[PDB]
UniProtKB/Swiss-Prot annotation, chain B:
Localization, UniProt: Plastid, Chloroplast
Chain spans, region Extension peptide (EP): 1-27
E.C. designation(s): 1.16.3.1
Residues given in the record as Fe cation 2 binding sites: 80, 129, 163
GO biological process, any: iron ion transport
Protein name: Ferritin-4, chloroplastic
Gene Ontology molecular function, alphabetical: ferric iron binding; ferrous iron binding; ferroxidase activity
Family as reported in the entry's similarity comment: Belongs to the ferritin family.
Function statement: Stores iron in a soluble, non-toxic, readily available form. Important for iron homeostasis. Has ferroxidase activity. Iron is taken up in the ferrous form and deposited as ferric hydroxides after oxidation.
Length: 193, 196, 193, 194
């Protein structure tokens, strides 16, 4: 091994124009795009959770535990997006934030009750996010990006499994306690959890 | 530039949420073969825990009196049970159902005239750790073959690195026991282990 | 009393073969065997409780208080087995661990509800263990082993009575609160007890 | 049904007897052992090059104390990268074989770029080369089916390598922005106190 002989083809590949990443290495456009797509997925879920917070924070709904949970969840989802934005820049890809569509605003449900409906929606959104994460992982693996696949596994896939179980447990408890007094009590639990 | 519509895309995720009470709500892309393989590994770890407990019980005998080895095997048994429990918790995180299986009777006596009890037991422990490593790698192969990305990662992250460390650690014990020789040497090594 | 006269009959009986216990004194094979049986009983209950924990830790069951209680109980039970293994060695008996059978995996019950059913099962297991402990004490007394009897009463019988009252109270409370909200509430109490 | 005492037989009589043989080694093929040794030499060589760069920037007539400190610290860290692989080799029961280290360049001045920018561009290229080498090592592991070696490379090296590449890229970018003379000296003061 001769660093100065083998580093030559590396020093000649150092970008000249100011707009090109100096760090980018073995990071293909398809991977860059998939990371941007996931940033948009996380940001969308953040926005949906913020909508759910705004619903449960209504005076006539008055489920303070669920409001707090969705408010904190929204904040956490934004962090998930930001971590991906930072990762994008670590790899020398360019972050491209995309539009975020209007979420629903009302989360009432006659049969299920608002709490259960909202938690079932949250569970489905977390499972949807997991599918998107597995897709980002598929793009990494298809393109042979070893470090991207590891990043997704280490920072996202495990936590997503945990998030899914946590919400699943909420759905289960909400189904057990039933509407009315039980839901209010579950909400108190969540308020103080 | 709209590339994702959560409320349109969850629709299929919503009408897939179980209604029957015995069904997991969390389970997602976790196939029966993976679930079974995790149950099998739980039983592997629990068996090893029981075997180490048998070894503790032997070295704790008044006439054997190797307190460092007894302590090591006792702590190893507890750690192995933790390895089993972490897999049990993982099963439930993935929405699989834990099924504890029977645990076979271990040997009770670990004497060996030629090698000496201490070296014999450490070589046995080494072989058990290597066997467990093989089982773990087999569990990993099941995940990779079925394309379970997160199960493969769990196994690598939580088990494989530690297993390599456990194997080197016990290998070092075997080497030292061989170096010090039977009698005074083994007793001294045991004192070291007792205070390690 | 002449220690050195009375002792020469005890000094020449000190075992010489390395496989023989030096400590063992007035400890008959039946007592040694009965101690090994109780070790297996305690270990079996540890395993059953671990199976109970694994059931209540399911996302769709989501009774965190019961899950925690059975998890801690499994650990406590293994400690009960271990203390008997150590006792065996104190008396110069040889520990022989035996097979542990596969326990039930599922604990749902349509009529009683899962929580009440599992607590009634736990109560029955503790009563069975008590019967086994009293049988062990009986073996000790039949054989005139004074210190084995003492060890069982001091270390096991009192604790067993407390465990049985504790679980009986859980059963009673579960019956009082009823299924649904009540069970979930009881579970919260247990979670924080 | 799992029977530890039956299945352990295969392994129990595979336990090596000769003092020279690893007791730990399991599913670790010669090609992986060799590739780990190669990477040890890669890291050690980069450590040596950074030490050469330290020695240049520490010259009284160059007097870029921030860059000197940065390269000195980088040299020590690179030696730690080498040593972690040496320890890993022993964890897996492979035999460490240290190789020769070639003479590095001693002077890092550059008429057009200026010494600071040239040295940082060189460092960036060295880190990218090391990344390619690490990915090669990972490829050897994957090709040979060594699950734990691949995991070790990803966990201990690849993420850190990405961070080191971004870090030095940022230095190159800043040196380009501030330009030669007062700007470089000021960047150097920043790095000195970083
Ligand atoms: Ca998320
Ligand atoms: Ca932030
Ligand atoms: Ca942040
Ligand atoms: Ca571009
Ligand atoms: Ca939990
Ligand atoms: Ca283990
Ligand atoms: Ca634990
Ligand atoms: Ca535990
Ligand atoms: Ca099933
Ligand atoms: Ca990993
Ligand atoms: Ca007990
Ligand atoms: Ca203990
Ligand atoms: Ca203890
Ligand atoms: Ca006997
Ligand atoms: Ca008494
Ligand atoms: Ca009381
Ligand atoms: Ca390095
Ligand atoms: Ca060091
Ligand atoms: Ca060799
Ligand atoms: Ca990995
Ligand atoms: Ca930074």
């Amino acid at each position: 091994f001769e660093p100065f002989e083998e580093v030559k083809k590396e020093l000649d590949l150092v970008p000249t124009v100011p707009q090109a990443s100096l760090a980018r290495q073995k990071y293909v456009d398809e991977s860059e795009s998939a990371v941007n797509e996931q940033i948009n997925v996380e940001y969308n879920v953040s926005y949906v959770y913020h909508a759910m917070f705004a619903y449960f924070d209504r005076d006539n709904v008055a489920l303070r535990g669920l409001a707090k949970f969705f408010k904190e969840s929204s904040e956490e989802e934004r962090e998930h997006a930001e971590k991906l934005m930072e990762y994008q820049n670590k790899r020398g890809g360019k972050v491209k934030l995309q539009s975020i569509v209007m979420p629903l605003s009302d989360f009432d449900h006659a049969d299920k009750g608002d709490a259960l409906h909202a938690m079932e929606l949250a569970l489905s959104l977390e499972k949807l996010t997991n599918e998107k994460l597995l897709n980002l992982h598929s793009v990494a693996t298809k393109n042979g990006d070893v470090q991207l696949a590891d990043f997704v596994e280490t920072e996202y896939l495990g936590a997503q499994v945990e998030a899914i179980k946590r919400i699943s447990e909420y759905v289960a408890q909400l189904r057990r306690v039933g509407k009315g007094h039980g839901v209010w009590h579950f909400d108190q639990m969540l308020l103080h959890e």
